[PDB]
Design goal:
Two copies of one chain form a homodimer. Chain A is an all-alpha fold. The first copy, chain A, has 17 helices and four strands. In chain A, α12 packs parallel to α14. The structure holds protoporphyrin IX containing FE (2 copies) and the ligand CCS(=O)(=O)N1CCC2(CC[C@@H]([C@H]3c4ccccc4-c4cncn43)[C@H]2O)CC1 (2 copies). The site of one protoporphyrin IX containing FE (HEM) has 24 residues of chain A, from α7, α16 and α17. Chain A: It comes from Homo sapiens.
Chain lengths: ~375, ~375
């Protein structure tokens, strides 16, 4: 098994198992706002409500799940506060009574004070029926921004893809064991199981079309997920009033912050973070938005010997095909994902009364993946 | 420390006993690198580079031959791009050098530009193998121009690196001491770290004896500069035959030194935390370190915090030992600010950026100073 210090679950992987839904009564004022964001944003009540909050101590968030729930709560409120109704009117200062505890909590959890993938995908879910499986029909999100924002469809499909990819994480100890022990057959089997899970993860992705509408995604949800790093709207970042004097820049959410896909790039020696380029820089930076235990797990994988070099050295057609099957699965995922971006970003952007830079980043990452094929 | 991190007992992150000569196959590269001052001064460097045939990197069969080739190709690239360093600039690196350089850079997981690991850590030799690592028993392998003080700059940098790196071997003692709750051992370890970082500063004092401000500013500064955020090459460098579009890569920085980054990490200074530019920059420079050295840094980040261990213990002895380490880093950076004033700011004022560079350095110094438990 993988060590407990990396906080990787057997079933959900890097996802938070059975996320907490309710905070202690002490934090009811936070909970009320986060639970009613759609109506409070729409009616222009959200900002005054956040401004009228009292500064609450984080000390009564006594465990990890409560701290992670609070991060999800405060992060959603923070996006609602900064972006407002999502029409380009921006708050440049986050008031101290929310900014201070959010920054304190974020420092405690070693995550930046902005909504991350680990909040809004990995900790933002529940089973409707605990006795039924982790499927879309038996799941809901904990928080959404606006009515019709398609956040359920986006967050849950993202979660399910993550969970399907994560079924191969438990094979990783076997891989490195098989290399050190020079176990060709064990390694071959292990690589075939990884390809199977990454192939399965692609089929899970196909659901996105059923539960997310392009127009709503582009015009609404995209807005609330965006951040303030290299964002012309918040040129210098956001002022977290009372914590830092200067405005601070933090990137909005990205599945670049997903540890599973970074994990298999590392495992397969794809070297996405190597070389000093723009795309590498971004994906390396995104590791700071991951929970520290998961950050550490990626670092650990990078310190182990290369699977790619092991397979490359061996003159073993069986191993090369199994290796290549893992790489092909990552390329196919990334290729399908590009087609998603065309449908959900490029086309809606063209229809409104940038895209190329986003596509080029994704194509760089895909190409680096394809270029790791041995055959 | 595991041998997979490629940290030497004597020279730490430096490459022990660097290779001086490449295989005969690469003589054409070696000639240009060995005669850069002569070729630049005669206006023959660019022609010589352009006359090169594309040589395969497959005959560079070990890590040291590859690190030497990187240093050679890196120095040739700086000379080719910058020329005589008067503003006559090349935006296209010819394919016959660009291809092998990028191929080799990919193999070693480094950006295709001269980095600290090339021009400091791999750019040296002992004169007498039987004598210690001192300035007078050492030389650099490559310089750019005559009188550029590259020996002084690169070797003093290396000596400071090595002095500081004597503390690296203590790091596993620190974590073992913590995990095992060995207070006296941890205290002794932290005092040794402080001693070495204090020694590094004394070694730094030698810079004044071997580098002249004018030569440094007007000559060497040029050849060390890169093409990331540089108006001279706004869109970066075209590496002909490897990539179609120009690529931006940062010039050398001792932010690329793994020793100072590792002690920041060890002492919980957290230079790469938060939403500021200094953090981003120091984070980016890790990409310009050799991969095993990158790995080592992140592995230190995964161990428990020394700072939070010391903060928890109500132990004046431990706190003082901890602060002596932090103070040693503060003293180095404060001294380094004076060095920037002498070697950059003053020459710049005398000529017929500086604020930005000093603001960056002050932010990093401040982050260090603010990790002190007690006022220094
Ligand atoms: C409406 C659906 C989606 C759209 C429009 C979309 C769009 C984008 C865009 C524009 C980027 C580049 C900017 C950034 O990093 O934030 C990106 C990155 C990324 N996305 Fe998505 N995405 C969607 C859903 C998903 C899903 C379900 C996955 C799960 C596989 C995913 C995986 C990734 C990964 C791993 C990256 C980082 C680059 C890479 O590793 O290839 N995305 N996405
Ligand atoms: C002529 C001598 C030197 C001058 C003019 C100089 C100047 C500078 C400048 C302008 C920077 C900021 C830009 C950059 O990162 O490249 C810098 C960074 C840095 N320098 Fe130097 N430097 C000199 C020598 C040294 C030496 C010998 C050391 C060894 C201690 C050193 C250590 C550092 C470190 C560690 C950084 C990154 C910021 C930090 O960690 O504080 N420098 N230097
Ligand atoms: C860059 C400003 S932008 O306005 O052009 N812009 C880019 C497109 C997105 C769409 C989803 C979002 C990101 C994310 C946030 C949270 C949870 C999962 C995922 C995810 C999965 N793939 C990508 N993302 C981000 O890439 C929104 C913001
Ligand atoms: C920004 C373009 S600039 O022209 O203003 N400019 C900044 C000042 C420097 C001075 C040395 C150099 C860097 C370095 C390169 C190789 C080996 C060790 C070290 C080193 C140590 N401290 C700093 N550096 C860089 O920071 C030159 C270029």
């Amino acid at each position: 098994m993988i060590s407990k210090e990396y906080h990787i679950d057997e079933e959900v992987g890097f996802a938070l198992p059975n996320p907490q839904e309710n905070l202690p009564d002490f934090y009811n004022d936070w909970m009320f706002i986060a639970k009613h964001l759609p109506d409070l944003i729409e009616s222009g009540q959200l900002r005054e409500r956040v401004e009228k909050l009292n500064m609450l101590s984080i000390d009564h968030l006594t465990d990890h799940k409560s701290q992670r729930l609070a991060r999800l709560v405060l992060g959603c409120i923070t996006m609602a506060y900064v972006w407002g109704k999502g029409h380009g009117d921006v708050r440049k200062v986050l008031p101290r009574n929310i900014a201070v505890p959010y920054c304190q909590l974020s420092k405690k959890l070693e995550l930046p004070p902005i909504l991350v993938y680990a909040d809004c995908v990995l900790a933002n879910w529940k089973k409707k029926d605990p006795n039924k499986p982790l499927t879309y029909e038996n799941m809901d999100v904990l928080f959404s921004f606006r009515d019709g924002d398609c956040s359920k469809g986006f967050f849950l499909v993202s979660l399910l893809v993550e969970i399907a990819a994560a079924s191969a994480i438990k094979v990783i100890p076997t891989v490195f064991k098989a290399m050190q022990m020079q176990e060709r057959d064990t390694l071959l089997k292990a690589l075939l199981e990884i390809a199977s899970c990454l192939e399965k993860a692609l089929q899970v992705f196909h659901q996105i079309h059923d539960h997310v509408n392009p127009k709503a995604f582009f015009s609404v949800l995209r807005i609330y997920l965006s951040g303030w790093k290299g964002n012309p709207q918040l040129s210098d970042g956001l002022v977290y009033e009372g914590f830092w004097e200067d405005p601070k820049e933090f990137a909005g959410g990205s599945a670049g912050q997903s540890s599973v896909f970074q994990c298999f790039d590392v495992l397969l020696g794809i070297q996405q973070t190597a070389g000093g380029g723009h795309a590498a820089q971004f994906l390396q930076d995104m590791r700071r938005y991951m929970p520290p235990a998961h950050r550490n797990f990626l670092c650990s994988l990078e310190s182990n010997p290369s699977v790619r070099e092991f397979v490359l050295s061996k003159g073993d057609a069986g191993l090369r095909e199994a290796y290549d099957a893992c790489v092909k699965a990552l390329v196919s995922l990334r290729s399908y994902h590009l087609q998603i971006v065309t449908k959900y970003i490029l086309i809606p952007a063209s229809q409104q009364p940038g895209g190329t830079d986003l596509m080029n980043f994704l194509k760089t990452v895909r190409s680096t993946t394809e270029k790791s094929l041995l055959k």
